[PDB]
Structure 1
Amino acid sequence: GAPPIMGSSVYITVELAIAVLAILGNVLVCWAVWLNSNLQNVTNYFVVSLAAADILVGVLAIPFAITISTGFCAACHGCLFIACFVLVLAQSSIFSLLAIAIDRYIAIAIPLRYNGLVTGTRAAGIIAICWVLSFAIGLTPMLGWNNCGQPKEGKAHSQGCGEGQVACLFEDVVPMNYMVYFNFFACVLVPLLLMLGVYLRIFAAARRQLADLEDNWETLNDNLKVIEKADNAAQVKDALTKMRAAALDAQKKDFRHGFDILVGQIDDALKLANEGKVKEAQAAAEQLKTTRNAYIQKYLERARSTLQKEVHAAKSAAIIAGLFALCWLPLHIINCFTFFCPDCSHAPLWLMYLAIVLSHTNSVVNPFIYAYRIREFRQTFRKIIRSHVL
């Protein structure tokens, strides 16, 4: 049996190395939001509420993890705070993720009423409510759902613990039924499943909007080409009416003239054919071709350009929410095993160290996703390096 101090120096070093990277990267995000006003919006106010949770991980949660690793003697309730504080920071992070997904869903689904729903002051109050709920969910064991009533007297005397003190160990103070049913299934697994469902509606609604533009465009141009080889005066009344319903369906100030000019030329062709004049109406329809291929077609590509921009942000936020579940599921399934298969042997200590270290890594990857995926966060970052390194 090798001395345990050697088998722990690499653990403390990895925990301290991750803590330093968690404090620097996330503070840099909070510094860019305060500096650039373009980064000040409802979406990023939830990013700061998440970066603040990642900062406190490397400031308090990681020092708490190194402390409990020793099993030091302390009051049973004082040990509960050191063991369950990371649950508070993990709860608000889930709330920030679920809040960002809802905000992006409103932007793509209801863009006309987005400015009326979300507000700088309405989002700030949601953050405060989420932080209060995260303390309630995270500190549930301190309200009596703990193992203080049945302390392990054999280990208390072993660490030389005084009267009333116990060996601060997570599995000995936090019940497993709380970690698996109340924390994992209810407060972690269920919220993540909703995030998966909200993101499916976002990408599906975006695809539906793209299909309308192409379908509304197909109904526009292909219907006008029908009248170029027409037969009766009513045969063009159908095709011009098909383009009229598609002109308004696609309209849903640079295009304000563009549609008013094109729809006006359309109505000046129904009546021209409403009187039997088929050849005179087709001549007025070539005037639509200029409008179609000059003053309106730029809108269908600008609207298509904005949709692709908005979806790109939905992927960037979904990548972050996906990386959160990846870093936290291994720890939760280990608990599931210890709780569901008692005949099984408990997971070895070296695997417990990998699951905990992996769960702390989540507090480091988020500042990297903002840069590599958001252009404005990159440039604001770079201005901080240039205006600080010198």
Structure 2
Amino acid sequence: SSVYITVELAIAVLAILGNVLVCWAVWLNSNLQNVTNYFVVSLAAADIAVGVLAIPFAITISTGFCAACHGCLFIACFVLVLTQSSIFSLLAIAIDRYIAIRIPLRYNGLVTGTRAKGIIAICWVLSFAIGLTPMLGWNNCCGEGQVACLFEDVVPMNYMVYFNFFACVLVPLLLMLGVYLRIFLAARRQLKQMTLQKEVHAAKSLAIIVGLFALCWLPLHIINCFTFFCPDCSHAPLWLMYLAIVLSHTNSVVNPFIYAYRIREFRQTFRKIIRSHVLENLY
């Protein structure tokens, strides 16, 4: 469907623009160049890859074009790896902020620049390990020896429900939920030391982080559980699939905003960049 393709392409553009802008801001601004933002830049890097590589590959999987089954599995697996890294790099930010709020003194002694690279590498090795698991044999595998290249044709739903949804969406969501509720509690404690309007604002801001992650990722994976556990049910309609797939990719558009745009230092840097680009054409 044309609507799916173009909406999907819009998001890819918006994903590249917003995340390059985040990355560019860290390169220019000297104050943004510190260990805590390694996690933001890794996230932003992953989201660019989602826009450039993962979404175009996801578009191809929608067409059911003719290809060798194991070629089709490789493309589907590549979409999984890149989206997984986006989710795991997102989790890394929450683990960082958890250490920061729970163990605030040792933070600088625990969270070193080298150890942060360790964490980021683990995020990407876990992405490959999990997203390429179907290539190792756990799969459902035009001229002879070719098939219609579709996602649910090559990637088994037991993998998606028992391993992928559990490991890559549900656990992260639960961890993030738990982490941000503990950070909120610390904020409300310190607010009391120094207006419940300020507490409500804080609660709202952390609700938005976890709420958006759940809004983006749960629809498609909830639907996948429905598909897996009810093989007798008529399958979810194709417009709903396109909606849910699109929603999952739209995490990469809002991930810039909520994370980076919640830092004043990023916000001011964005002004100076857009302004100095317009001052540049109008001389």
TM-score, normalising length: structure 2:
0.89
Q: 1:86 to 1:322 in 2, by over 3 A?
A: farther
Measured against aligned partners, the alpha-carbon deviations of 1:21-77 in whole angstroms (never above 9, x if no partner) come to 111111000011111122123322111111111111111111112212221111211
Tell me, yes or no, if the aligned pair for 2:139 and 2:156 is still in contact at 8 Å. yes
Tell me, yes or no, if the aligned pair for 2:40 and 2:260 is still in contact at 8 Å. no
Alpha-carbon distance, 1:134 to partner:
0.6
Tell me, yes or no, if the aligned pair for 2:64 and 2:150 is still in contact at 8 Å. yes
Measured against aligned partners, the alpha-carbon deviations of 1:278-337 in whole angstroms (never above 9, x if no partner) come to xxxxxxxxxxxxxxxxxxxxxxx9996799999999975663343122101000011111
1:75-114 matches, within 5 Å, as: 75-114=68-107
3-state SS of paired residue (1:342): coil
Q: 1:114 to 1:314 in 2, by over 3 A?
A: farther
Using CA pairs below 8 Å that are at least 6 residues apart, which structure has the higher relative contact order? Answer: 2
Determine which of 259, 266, 271 is the counterpart of 1:377: 266
Partners of 1:366 and 1:374 lie apart in 2 by 13
Measured against aligned partners, the alpha-carbon deviations of 1:1-28 in whole angstroms (never above 9, x if no partner) come to xxxxxxx222221111111111111100
Alpha-carbon distance, 1:189 to partner:
0.7
Q: 1:106 to 1:308 in 2, by over 3 A?
A: farther
Determine which of 141, 144, 155 is the counterpart of 1:174: 155
Q: 1:318 to 1:98 in 2, by over 3 A?
A: farther
Structure 1: stretches of 5+ with no match in the other structure: 1-7, 149-160, 209-300
1:206 aligned onto 2:187: yes
Partners of 1:175 and 1:136 lie apart in 2 by 16
Partners of 2:173 and 2:200 lie apart in 1 by 20
Look up the match of 1:212: none
Measured against aligned partners, the alpha-carbon deviations of 1:188-233 in whole angstroms (never above 9, x if no partner) come to 212211221222222234444xxxxxxxxxxxxxxxxxxxxxxxxx
Partners of 2:16 and 2:127 lie apart in 1 by 21
Measured against aligned partners, the alpha-carbon deviations of 1:155-203 in whole angstroms (never above 9, x if no partner) come to xxxxxx2232222111110111011111112332122112212222222
Q: 1:318 to 1:140 in 2, by over 3 A?
A: farther
Partners of 1:333 and 1:41 lie apart in 2 by 38
Measured against aligned partners, the alpha-carbon deviations of 1:84-110 in whole angstroms (never above 9, x if no partner) come to 222112222222222211211222222
Partners of 1:310 and 1:183 lie apart in 2 by 36
Tell me, yes or no, if the aligned pair for 2:88 and 2:168 is still in contact at 8 Å. no
3-state SS of paired residue (2:100): helix
Tell me, yes or no, if the aligned pair for 1:22 and 1:364 is still in contact at 8 Å. yes
Determine which of 203, 208, 213 is the counterpart of 1:324: 213
Determine which of 99, 109, 132 is the counterpart of 1:139: 132
Tell me, yes or no, if the aligned pair for 2:169 and 2:217 is still in contact at 8 Å. no
Partners of 1:311 and 1:27 lie apart in 2 by 32
Q: 1:380 to 1:132 in 2, by over 3 A?
A: same
Q: In terms of mean alpha carbon deviation, does 347-356 or 90-99 score higher? A: 90-99
Tell me, yes or no, if the aligned pair for 1:370 and 1:378 is still in contact at 8 Å. no
Alpha-carbon distance, 1:137 to partner:
0.7
- Percent identity over the alignment is 96
Tell me, yes or no, if the aligned pair for 2:187 and 2:202 is still in contact at 8 Å. no
Tell me, yes or no, if the aligned pair for 1:61 and 1:85 is still in contact at 8 Å. yes
Q: Aligned pair count? A: 278
Q: 1:200 to 1:370 in 2, by over 3 A?
A: closer
Partners of 2:27 and 2:97 lie apart in 1 by 22
Mark the structure with the bigger radius of gyration: 1
Q: 1:82 to 1:91 in 2, by over 3 A?
A: same
Q: 1:17 to 1:140 in 2, by over 3 A?
A: same
Tell me, yes or no, if the aligned pair for 1:203 and 1:311 is still in contact at 8 Å. no
Q: 1:164 to 1:306 in 2, by over 3 A?
A: farther
Alpha-carbon distance, 1:368 to partner:
2.4
Measured against aligned partners, the alpha-carbon deviations of 1:112-169 in whole angstroms (never above 9, x if no partner) come to 2111110112101211121111111111111110011xxxxxxxxxxxx223222211
Tell me, yes or no, if the aligned pair for 1:88 and 1:137 is still in contact at 8 Å. yes
Tell me, yes or no, if the aligned pair for 1:46 and 1:99 is still in contact at 8 Å. yes
